[PDB]
Each structure stands twice: as structure tokens, then as C-alpha cells.
Prior knowledge:
dimeric; Plasmodium Falciparum CCT Inhibitors Fragments; choline-phosphate cytidylyltransferase (chains A, B); transferase
Amino acid sequence: SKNVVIYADGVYDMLHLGHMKQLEQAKKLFENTTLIVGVTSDNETKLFKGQVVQTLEERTETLKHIRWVDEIISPCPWVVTPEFLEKYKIDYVAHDEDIYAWLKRAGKFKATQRTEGVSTTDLIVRILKNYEDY
Amino acid sequence: SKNVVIYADGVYDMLHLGHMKQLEQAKKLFENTTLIVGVTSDNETKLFKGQVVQTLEERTETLKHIRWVDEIISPCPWVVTPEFLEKYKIDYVAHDEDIYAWLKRAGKFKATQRTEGVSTTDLIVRILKNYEDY
């Protein structure tokens, strides 16, 4: 019944049901939680991960509408640090590990899963299938 | 401070920021509301309105994650009736009128607006612009 602070982060480009289910899962890791969601910057995402359609402001504005999201850190640090966790009093990081090893060492790592086949780009693929190759 | 029951309905295909802002606006029409959202059936939408990518189940599941949504009626009636409003004790219908005339006559119509330029298909148009015509 004590309130547990959960942190999840990501790009959240073109927010879809898969993102929303993952946030739900992070939010429900304990009975009483505060889910903080970190949204990665445009430059760092594009440099280290890949292409992003939506700006930081757009990706953050959309997340604001999601039931499970209690707080947003936008932009968030590209790499989580013990001091970041102390600064925001985070009890657990929820993620789907080499880079995360200190997190599991500290007892601060909580697994979540990705849903496949529910992405925004998957929906466009379905639209295009109305048009026969021949 | 008395609790006002608001009803909004739509297709909610490929849910985007524009839908979410409209739901927010319906939810915030009064201080204390219950926002019921009606999701139109696949057959009726395709027959009377146009093409839908996502099924009723998919469109409803996504809406479930939206902060402003308190209850969902899925599928909802294609045409709102005074008896439907009595049945679910709806105080106001939030919509963006010839068909709605009885609603304004009854004092039960509340306007909301559409945001342009924030749709899911608008995002694919942006992706495609990375590829020069020549």
C-alpha cells in the first residue's frame, strides 16, 4: 500500500496500442504507483537509435492523454543514472541486461513486454493490402 | 459540483491526438463529469460513412487507454435517440444541426472542435516526404 515510483522511458513515436499496453503494465507493477515516463530527445534518438517522425513536443503531448501516465520527464536523459533515480526518488525502472546490469544489481529493474503486430506502421500495411499487386 | 454525464461518439479509427483533444474537451465541459464514449460498429460505419482500418474490438481497446474516457459503449447505436439518452442518463451529447436539431432543442448539445493536421495519416505523409520526387 506504500506508493511505489516507477520509471519507464522510450521514444513513443507514433504512439500505438503496444506502447499503451507497456505503460499499463509498468503502472500496474504494484498496487499503488506513480508512473513517470521519460521521452527521449529528437537529436539523441536520431543519433543513437534511428528515425523519428514526431518531435519531442508532439510525442510528449500525445503521452499526456494516456491514463497510466502520472508524470512525464521531457526530454529525458538518454542514459539512466543512479543519481537520476535518486533525484526523482524512483523505486523501479520498467524496461523490456548489459546496460541495465546495475539496475538489476540494485533490485531496481522490472520487466515489461512488447506487443507485436499492433504498431502504427502495421496499420498502414493493412490499408495498402486493399490494393492488389495485379 | 453535481456530476454531469457527457456522451460523445465516433469511429475512433487509428486514434490520434485530434481524437484525444476532442475527448478531453468533452470531458472538461463541466467540473464534474462522466464521459461515455460510443464506438460505431464496423458494418454501419462502412455502409454509411466510409472505410475503417481497425475493427470495433481494436478501436475500443485503444480508447480504453485514454485518460478522459470514463465509460465506453461498444458498439454504439449509429443514431442517437432520446430513449438512448434516458437509458444511460446522459445529460449532454458532445459533438463537433439538421440531425442534431432535437438535441439543441432539448438543451442537450455541447459543441467540441476538431484539430486539423494531427491525424495518423498526416504522419505517414510526413514520412513519405523524406523521399524526393526526383
